[PDB]
Ligand binder design. Structure first.
Ligand code: CL
Ligand code: MG
Lengths: 250, 241, 235, 231, 244, 111, 243, 240, 229
């Protein structure tokens, strides 16, 4: 046995293209649409729960994941690749940051760590790149609210608002017309739901849409009282009912 | 064209080895079904013993992973037993480290994560199997979680796997459209097994003897498989109404 | 591509057979064994007149009782010599004696097939190992990259080998003197060399029981070249 | 064809071409014969020279006082395998105060050769061996092939033109098995057997190599004027 | 076995070129242009962000210009992710040197170290090289203000003015024409922007498409300041030099 | 605490003549005040006309002799059945003994 | 195409062609069988006499694992030996940790997982043997047959090698004509017959019969070779049935 | 670890990776070495395709290995740094254990040994570099000049050149260098080295580097103006 | 390095004309506590060897498992496992002796003293000792622990040198051993009345006697002993 693939499976072609990264981006393009919008007092990330069978319980599949109490992530592309990245991203937030500084990492630095993991799958021996693009939303005391995109190559960019996957080109044009620097969080959620309706074919409701925010601190979700400086997570996943309420005012 | 031999991306963003592992899944020509009751989770699978020289008692694709978790496999037996031994090891290690029985959905995730690694690392091939895990979880109740060669998994109200999965899937879909509930509203597991067998008969259009089926039942704190005579009693009750 | 340790359909290792071709391109080396000593001689083959020919070291001492001459990719020989010297000295440390010439040759030849996917390829150099011990007297061995070694009364390796070996076939007898053997090496080297043989583009050496392994001075070889010229003009 | 690049690849008919190519190296090697009675076991080997100035390549290797082999094929591979046998014979003596059975020696050689046929990177051994020995169950002769297959025999031959010596032994089976307590007559039968594989060349004093092991006879090799008696 | 699938990233061509290095350089030629200009009283680093969007958050963005320590900065051309791996290595190397000698790392020593890391990926390991070229702008008390470049081969050279990335041929001709040895920072700022404005593939050069940085002894007395320009400060220097 | 050494007593004597040599030793093996054996051979024929005895701790003594006998066997294999001379055997034993310099064979050896 | 050049590569069918090519080496080998009897198991094998120079009864093919398990195989003999060596290590570690001798189904999975592991990577070749094995444990007699893929099942009777179709037919008759079961001594006789009948596929060269058995009553649950009078009795019974 | 055999034999007995490493040397800028009666001079070409270069800080072509030995090269610049580092470490290691600086032959033998090792080690390619190593042995006034190449062969030279158009400058040296009477002074040796480069260089401006090494660790690099005076004097004698 | 915990006391043995006898009591002591009264310390290997062990019982049980595994291993691919290639006493001893010396040399000894008694293929008597240090020796009589001090003197009166072995019958030899076991019961504080005895004869094979008791004990004279002076 032994892993005898100690060599790179991603190489430069004569034209300077890294084939496997380009092909990973093609896999991302086929994936279901996800988006993110940044408001003055928050950030929203959203995607369609494309259920593979109606017998499947799509609540058990989480496309929007908590990484830290103040940072959340969504994806487009290969779901299993996303799941293992979320596991690795949660762990690296602790090992390379919280166990050292006693606090959760800021959004940009956790993104930096995820990016690093994705870069290494692009150069290390005997592996293919990750077939996902991530949208990571988060808050931290000194940088405030932020939204980042991370691609298969490991490259990352900050966004006011963006979309990835299937209908990203059309969605990004929709967001350009609606986005301004004076948006409140509710306005951004409203725009997120309007944008996502365009890319969805079938049912459009709280059970087929997954949507989460990075907003105010939720002391009700902390699980304990008695420490004034601990005020709770800023990440909150919206319920099926909370989505449907905002679909009547749509 | 070496992008079809190992798990690297094709120009279309596809992993052909993963797709071909899905095709290996149906090599046994066996169909499985899983459903949830109020207090139980039932899994049934076709049993085919083509050779008279075989010991029919040793022919099985349903496995007892832990006391609480059962697993039915759709795919070749070597890969099935590979996945089984590993799942058993993982469930035992979990209990030792964390002090409680590994939940069905957590084991599914773990095995799915292992399957994901074979789709990303070149030296390891995917296993040509679909793993359906069943239990009565102490937190979530009756549970069906299924894993495939892509590393995908999800929970199910009910499910079906094999060459004729679509026929069984639609049959189950239509039933749950009528009842408007997420389970079989029945007290005893015996009647939930009778439901599972009846609806497989209707979907496949074939009759079954005691030796043509294989049944696994998950209740609170134990998963067990039925003997041929326990199945015979089940078949007699179906025929008498 | 294909394995480095692969067998051909004829039952030969491709890489070993190819290394033998590299040795055919190398400069000529000749050895002749007598009852009075073993003589070793080489063609230096300087690529340009500005190259200081005395820095071309194709004859090398392993121990006082064992010499060595090389032909082929001579850079590959350095680690083989290092190993030989170490084996010779190490055995003297362990056993308070000189090592047998055969045992030394065998130790060198054990390295030869340690290649795969250890070193990445066989050695591209053949060695003539000459020496004396008490048990078997004056000996000459031919160590290949296959791991095989043959003992020889006389042997030529390198680009002029098959022509030289045919000449050694006729000229060698069991009563040869050391002086006769020195002239015979010079004669056959002069025959197969491209350039005209002199003391600066050819080198002699020997191994005797009394004096051990000695590389000849250019002045000493020059006299033996003049002695050769006169005795060929004598008939 | 497409399935001979390495030892890890079966062909469509279930053949291992690298192993078969290694088997071919044996057929190119010089002839060697093995035969035994109930009391003694004999190896006879035709040594091969490079030319008239060169020595004749040694074919027989001693492994212990009671065991040794003859080779045909790649001589360095014989050195590797015989060294392994020397160690196993020696381990048996040091640890268990026990002379290694010839049958068990065969089993160890089989398993060593097998590992090189199932793994990537390596290569099969390119040599065939005839192991003779005298142990607690009498005289023995073994034939080792680098496929892994080891076989116990009354007599055999391997190398180029070995079929002639093998047929002779197949005829003489009933005669030479009965040569008990007569080492010289058993060697005579081995020399007469190897003679059936000669063409153009004949058995000279530095050409022939003989070994013997028996009841009260340690494994000993005869070369040079010690074999002139049998020419 | 596995040999079948090996690209062999560290071999020579028949002509004696390293395939992967050459192809990595081809990749870098499509990346945004980065310029470095060295003056007597400082160094300028200018770089063009690649075809941006109106929805990109520019003030918190950094793809081109990175700080290695207080005295040394780099401009990046190529794969951003690859560059960050090397950048973090370089930042550690600088701190290792500071801990050991209690002095800031000389610029060349840092450049040689990174360049040696790149060299290794071309000679051993069977991995693809880093698809990154750097411009290093730095100061130390031995050689003063220094500009270097390094590329995927691991070769590095020193410069008075240099470009990497897209349109280096056109950019290097324009720099060669207008550069003088007695030049000052304010003039070098203007030259860097004028060069980018002429070589750009975009229709016009605006503040949102640029990253800009200076290393000046314009720091109060006998010390060196690094200034990474803010979006509004790039907008002001574009109006001052008469480009917008 | 575990003591890995012991004392098995015994006495040995070597004398070199003009064209001969003798190596003698008593056959008594002991621990403390008990006799283990009245006849436990201590001087051994090691082949190549060499006799050896390693007196002191009998386990280490038997180990050393066993390893030297083995060294003679492998000398024959590795060097074309050459006779191991007494001086060469002596140098070889030095290396066997010094190989355990930091956990010694607790014996006085004579060949 | 190219899917058959490397082990562990799925073809577009979902097949591992290298494993299927290993089966061809198995099919090329000599015939070997297994019969499950009332309180035990019988193993038999065809040994081709290539030459008069082969010493009769010496080149033993059937192998014991622990003291209660027999193993026989057809195909590449060295691969079988390698698998048995592993089986011996597995049975040794099981007994070391758990005290009791390894149960047969437990032992079956140990071989199964090891063979299956040689279909997971291109750095290794699949096994070129089908192995018939079994014995007696606390739950009674067990007979197994294990393929190059790692696949194994329990059997009433089993057969592999060049004469497998012939043998299988003969085994199927025994199953039908004896639903109550077969005695150990009967199974030895029947095993001899089946090898002799299966020798028609290898009729060019003559052969040597080799039989072994584990029986609760006849061998105390230990693996033994059939020798002497009992072997000759089974040869005579076999020779009478072919004529 | 990556074990792949990149340097292997071909059917005609050639190791192509070693031969292609020589082709990289052919592409490199010309380097020349000439030894006089009491000195050695190392000349090196600088390609003038690169202006706007900072010559203060740019890696210089001649590198000191110790205070008494220098190394110049032709081929891959990045590869040369690895050999120079290893050589510098070995030079200090030799001083530390033998209590004497390396001979020029010893240092050459070491560097050549490294080059050879990279032609039969798994996972590695050969160095695309040939070197000229020059200097004086400790307490010795005899000049030393050696050459190495990717294969790992080495040898001593009265005068030698390597790199692009080295065939031309070797032609010049073979007719202009007399062994019975080598350049007696520093001037004569530098003049012959500049002359040899002027056969190939283009402009005699910032394209020629000259480094003079004398006995007892006396090493100096000539400036632009000093070299420019040699360039001036050569062509004025040529106009005749 | 350890300390022995549960321990077995003397093993005693001797040669006689046609074979060897070995014996050992059935006690496992836990310091001064006579904890385990049914421990078998003579462990037969085949029908030609008996290994008697004293010292640490856990280490004995380990050695017992090594010998069990040695028989299994010898039978593998060995058609003559019950005949010419059966395990000999000399093979079993040398293996143990190797292990004992290797274990002391890693400073982690098997805390035992072992006697291997048996008969060889050619009928020769085999009797040899090995202990935790790897020390080995042979003698017409051998004994461990207290047996060395008390049994050997009594057994050496029967067989004093080699020439006394053919003159000693199996009846005389067994008698001597049984008397020695009684003496050890009188005088060893960590011994028991119950013991096992094994005879290995070149003609009659291996006879293994269990549940033997020390009998014909003299205690009556105790009644007359009064005070301490
Ligand atoms: Cl996991
Ligand atoms: Mg894979």
């Amino acid at each position: 046995m032994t892993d005898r693939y100690s060599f790179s499976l991603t190489t430069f072609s004569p034209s300077g293209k890294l084939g496997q990264i380009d092909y990973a981006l093609t896999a991302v393009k086929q994936g279901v649409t996800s988006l993110g919008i940044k408001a003055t007092n928050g950030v929203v990330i959203a995607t369609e729960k494309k259920s593979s069978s109606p017998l499947a319980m799509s609540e058990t599949l989480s496309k929007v994941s908590l990484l830290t109490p103040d940072i959340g992530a969504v994806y487009s592309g290969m779901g299993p690749d996303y799941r293992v990245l979320v596991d690795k991203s949660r762990k690296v937030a602790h090992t390379s940051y919280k166990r050292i500084y006693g606090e959760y990492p800021p959004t940009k630095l956790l993104v930096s760590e995820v990016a690093k993991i994705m870069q290494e799958a692009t150069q290390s021996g005997g592996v293919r790149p990750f077939g996902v693009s991530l949208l990571i939303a988060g808050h931290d005391e000194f940088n405030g609210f932020s939204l980042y995109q991370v691609d298969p190559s490991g490259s990352y960019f900050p966004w006011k608002a963006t979309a990835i996957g299937k209908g990203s080109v059309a969605a990004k044009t929709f967001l350009e017309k609606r986005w301004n620097d004076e948006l409140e969080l509710e306005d951004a959620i409203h725009i997120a739901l309007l944008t996502l309706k365009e890319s969805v074919e079938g049912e459009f409701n709280g059970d087929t849409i997954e949507l989460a925010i990075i907003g105010d601190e939720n002391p009700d979700l902390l699980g304990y009282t008695g420490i004034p400086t601990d005020k709770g997570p800023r990440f909150r996943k919206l319920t099926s009912q909370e989505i449907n309420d905002r679909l009547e005012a749509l | 064209g070496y992008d079809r031999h190992i798990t690297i991306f094709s120009p279309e963003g596809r992993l052909y080895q993963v797709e071909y592992a899905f095709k290996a899944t149906n090599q046994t020509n066996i169909n499985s079904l899983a459903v949830r009751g109020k207090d139980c989770t039932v899994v049934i699978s076709q049993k085919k013993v083509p050779d008279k020289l075989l010991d029919p008692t040793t022919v099985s694709y349903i496995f007892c992973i832990s006391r609480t978790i059962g697993m039915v496999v759709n795919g070749p037996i070597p890969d099935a037993r590979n996945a089984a031994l590993r799942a058993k090891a993982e469930a035992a290690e979990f209990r030792y480290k964390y002090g409680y029985d590994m939940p069905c959905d957590v084991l599914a995730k773990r095995m799915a994560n292992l399957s994901q690694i074979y789709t990303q690392r070149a030296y390891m091939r995917p296993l040509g199997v679909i793993l359906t895990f069943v239990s009565v979880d102490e937190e979530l109740g009756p549970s069906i979680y299924k894993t495939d060669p892509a590393g995908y998994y999800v929970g199910y109200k009910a499910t079906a796997t094999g060459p004729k999965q679509q026929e069984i899937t639609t049959n189950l879909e239509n039933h749950f459209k009528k009842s408007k509930i997420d389970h079989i509203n029945e007290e005893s597991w015996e009647k939930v097994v009778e439901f599972a067998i009846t609806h497989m008969i209707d979907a496949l259009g074939t009759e079954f003897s005691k030796n043509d089926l294989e049944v696994g039942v998950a209740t609170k704190d134990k998963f067990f498989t039925l003997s041929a005579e326990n199945i015979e009693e089940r078949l007699v009750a179906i025929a008498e109404q | 591509d294909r394995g480095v340790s692969t067998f051909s359909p004829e039952g030969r290792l491709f890489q070993v057979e190819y290394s033998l071709e590299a040795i055919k391109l190398g400069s000529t080396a000749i050895g002749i064994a007598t009852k009075e000593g073993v003589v070793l001689g080489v063609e230096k083959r300087a690529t340009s007149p500005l190259l200081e020919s005395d820095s071309i070291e194709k004859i090398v001492e392993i121990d006082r009782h064992i010499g060595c001459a090389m032909s082929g990719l001579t850079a590959d020989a350095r680690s083989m010599i290092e190993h030989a010297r170490t084996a010779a000295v190490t055995h003297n440390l362990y056993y308070d004696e000189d090592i047998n010439v055969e045992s030394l040759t065998q130790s060198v030849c054990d390295l030869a097939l340690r290649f795969g996917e250890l070193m990445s390829r066989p050695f591209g150099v053949a060695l003539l190992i000459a020496g004396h011990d008490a048990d078997d007297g004056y000996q000459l061995f031919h160590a290949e990259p296959s791991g095989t070694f043959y003992r020889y009364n006389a042997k030529a390796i390198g680009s002029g080998s098959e022509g030289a070996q045919a000449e050694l076939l006729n000229e060698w007898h069991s009563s040869l003197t050391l002086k006769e053997a020195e002239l015979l090496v010079l004669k056959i080297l002069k025959q197969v060399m491209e350039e005209k043989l002199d003391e600066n583009n050819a080198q002699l050496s020997c191994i005797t029981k009394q004096d051990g392994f000695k590389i000849y001075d250019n002045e000493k070889t020059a006299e033996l070249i003049k002695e050769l010229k006169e005795k060929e003009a004598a008939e | 064809n497409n399935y001979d690049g390495d030892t890890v690849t079966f062909s469509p008919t279930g053949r291992l071409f690298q192993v078969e190519y290694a088997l071919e190296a044996i057929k190119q090697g010089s002839v060697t014969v093995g035969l035994r009675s109930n009391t003694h076991a004999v190896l006879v080997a035709l040594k091969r020279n490079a030319d008239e100035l060169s020595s004749y390549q040694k074919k027989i290797i001693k492994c212990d006082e009671h065991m040794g082999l003859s080779l045909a094929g790649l001589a360095p591979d014989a050195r590797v395998l015989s060294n392994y046998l020397r160690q196993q014979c020696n381990y048996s003596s040091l640890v268990f105060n026990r002379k290694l059975a010839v049958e068990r020696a065969g089993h160890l050689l089989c398993d060593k050769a097998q590992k090189n046929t199932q793994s990537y990177g390596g290569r099969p051994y390119g040599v065939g061996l005839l192991i003779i020995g005298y142990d607690k169950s009498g005289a023995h002769l073994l034939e080792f092939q680098p496929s892994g297959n080891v076989t116990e025999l009354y007599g055999t031959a391997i190398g180029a033109r070995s079929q002639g010596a093998k047929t002779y032994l197949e005829r003489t089976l009933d005669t030479f098995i009965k040569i008990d307590g007569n080492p010289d007559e058993l060697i005579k039968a081995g020399v007469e057997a190897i003679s059936q594989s000669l063409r153009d060349e004949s058995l000279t004093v530095d050409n022939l190599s003989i070994a013997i092991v028996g009841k009260d006879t340690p494994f000993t090799i005869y070369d040079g004027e010690a074999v002139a008696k049998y020419i | 076995g596995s040999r079948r699938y090996d690209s062999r990233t560290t071999i020579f061509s028949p002509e004696g070129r390293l395939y992967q290095v050459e192809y990595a350089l081809e990749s870098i030629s499509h990346a945004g242009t980065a310029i470095g200009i060295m003056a007597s009283d400082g160094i300028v680093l200018a770089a063009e962000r690649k075809v941006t969007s109106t929805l990109l958050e520019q003030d918190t963005s950094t793809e081109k210009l990175y700080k290695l320590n207080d005295k040394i900065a780099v401009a990046v051309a190529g794969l951003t992710a690859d560059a960050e791996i090397l950048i973090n290595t370089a930042r550690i190397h600088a701190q290792n040197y500071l801990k050991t000698y209690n002095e800031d790392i000389p610029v060349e020593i840092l450049v040689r170290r990174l360049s040696d890391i790149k060299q290794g990926y071309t000679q051993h390991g069977g991995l693809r090289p880093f698809g990154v070229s750097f411009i290093y702008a730095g100061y130390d008390d031995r050689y003063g203000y220094q500009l270097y470049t390094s590329n995927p081969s691991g070769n590095y050279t020193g410069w008075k003015a240099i470009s990497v990335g897209a349109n280096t041929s056109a950019a290097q001709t324009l720099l060669q024409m207008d550069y003088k040895d007695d030049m000052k920072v304010d003039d070098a700022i203007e030259l860097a922007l004028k060069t980018l404005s002429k070589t750009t593939d975009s229709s016009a050069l605006t503040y949102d498409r640029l990253e800009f940085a200076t290393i000046r002894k314009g720091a109060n007395d006998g010390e060196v300041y690094q200034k990474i320009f803010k979006p509004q400060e790039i907008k002001d220097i574009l109006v001052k030099t008469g480009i917008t | 605490q575990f003591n890995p050494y012991g004392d098995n007593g015994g006495t040995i004597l070597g004398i070199a003549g003009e064209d001969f040599a003798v190596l003698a030793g008593d056959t008594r093996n002991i621990t403390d005040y008990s006799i283990n054996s009245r006849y436990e051979p201590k001087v051994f024929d090691c082949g190549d006309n060499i006799v050896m005895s390693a007196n002191g701790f009998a386990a280490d003594g038997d180990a050393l002799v066993k390893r030297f006998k083995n060294s003679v066997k492998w000398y024959h294999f590795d060097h074309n059945d050459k006779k191991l001379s007494i001086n060469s055997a002596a140098r070889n034993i030095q290396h066997l003994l010094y190989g355990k310099r930091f956990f010694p064979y607790y014996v006085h050896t004579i060949i | 195409t190219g899917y058959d050049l490397s082990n562990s590569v799925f073809s577009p069918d979902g097949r591992n062609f290298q494993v299927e090519y290993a089966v061809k080496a198995v099919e090329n080998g000599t015939t070997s069988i297994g019969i499950k009897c009332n309180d035990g198991v019988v193993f038999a094998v065809e040994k081709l006499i290539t030459s008069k120079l082969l010493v009769p009864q010496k080149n033993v093919k059937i192998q014991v694992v622990d003291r209660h398990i027999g193993c026989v195989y057809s195909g590449l003999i060295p691969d079988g030996r390698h698998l048995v060596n592993r089986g011996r290590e597995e049975a040794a570690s099981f007994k070391k940790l758990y005290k009791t001798p390894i149960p047969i189904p437990a032992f079956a999975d140990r071989l199964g997982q090891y063979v299956q592991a040689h279909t997971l990577y291109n750095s290794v070749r699949p096994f070129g043997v089908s192995t018939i094995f079994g014995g007696v444990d606390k739950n009674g007699a067990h007979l197994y047959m294990l393929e190059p893929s790692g696949s194994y099942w329990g059997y009433k009777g089993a057969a592999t090698g060049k004469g497998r179709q012939s043998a299988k037919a003969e085994l199927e008759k025994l199953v039908d004509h004896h639903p109550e079961g077969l005695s150990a001594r009967e199974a030895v006789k029947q095993a001899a017959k089946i090898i002799y009948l299966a020798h028609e596929d290898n009729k060019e060269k003559d052969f040597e019969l080799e039989i072994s058995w584990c029986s609760l009553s006849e061998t105390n649950g230990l693996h033994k070779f059939v020798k002497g009078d009992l072997l000759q009795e089974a040869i005579d019974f076999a020779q009478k049935e072919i004529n | 670890g990556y074990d792949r055999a990149l340097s292997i034999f071909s059917p005609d007995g050639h190791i192509f990776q070693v031969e292609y490493a020589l082709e990289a040397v052919k592409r490199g800028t010309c380097a020349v070495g000439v030894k006089g009666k009491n000195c050695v001079v190392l000349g090196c070409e600088r390609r003038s395709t690169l202006k706007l270069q900072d010559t203060r800080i740019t890696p210089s072509k001649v590198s000191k290995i110790d205070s008494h030995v220098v190394l110049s090269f032709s081929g891959l610049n990045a590869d040369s740094r690895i050999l120079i580092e290893k050589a510098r470490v070995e030079a200090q290691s030799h001083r530390l254990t033998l209590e004497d600086p390396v001979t020029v032959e010893y240092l050459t033998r070491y560097v050549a040994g490294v080059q050879q090792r990279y032609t039969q080690s798994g996972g590695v390619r050969p160095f695309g570099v040939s070197t000229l190593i020059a200097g004086f042995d400790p307490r010795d006034d005899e000049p030393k000049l050696y050459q190495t190449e990717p294969s790992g062969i080495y040898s001593s030279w009265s005068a030698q050149t390597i790199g692009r158009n080295s065939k031309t400058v070797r032609e010049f040296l073979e007719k202009n260098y007399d062994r019975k009477e080598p350049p007696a002074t520093v001037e004569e040796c530098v003049k012959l080295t500049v002359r040899s480069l002027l056969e190939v260089v283009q402009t005699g401006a910032k394209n020629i580097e000259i480094t003079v090494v004398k006995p007892d660790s006396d090493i100096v690099a000539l400036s632009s103006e000093e070299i420019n005076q040699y360039v001036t004097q050569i062509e004025q004698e040529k106009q005749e | 390095t350890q300390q022995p915990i549960v321990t077995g006391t003397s093993v005693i043995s001797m040669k006689y004309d046609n074979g060897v006898i070995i014996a050992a009591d059935n006690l496992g002591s836990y310091g001064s506590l006579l904890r385990f009264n049914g421990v078998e310390r003579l462990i037969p290997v085949g029908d030609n060897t008996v290994v008697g062990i004293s010292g640490d019982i856990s280490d004995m049980q380990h050695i017992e498992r090594l010998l069990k595994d040695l028989v299994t291993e010898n039978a593998y691919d060995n058609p003559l496992a019950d005949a010419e290639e059966a395990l000999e006493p000399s093979y079993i001893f040398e293996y143990l002796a190797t292990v004992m010396y290797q274990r002391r040399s890693k400073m982690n000894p098997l805390w035992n003293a072992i006697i291997v008694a048996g008969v060889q293929s050619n009928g020769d008597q085999f009797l040899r000792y090995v202990n935790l240090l790897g020390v080995t020796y042979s003698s017409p009589t051998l004994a461990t622990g207290f047996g060395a001090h008390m049994a050997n003197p009594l057994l050496r009166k029967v067989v004093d040198r080699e020439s006394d072995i053919p003159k000693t019958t199996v009846q005389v030899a067994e008698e001597a051993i049984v008397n020695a076991m009684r003496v050890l019961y009188y005088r060893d504080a960590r011994s028991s009345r119950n013991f096992s005895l094994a005879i290995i004869d070149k003609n009659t094979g291996l006879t293994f006697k269990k549940n033997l008791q020390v009998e014909n004990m003299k205690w009556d004279f105790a009644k007359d002993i009064k005070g301490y002076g």
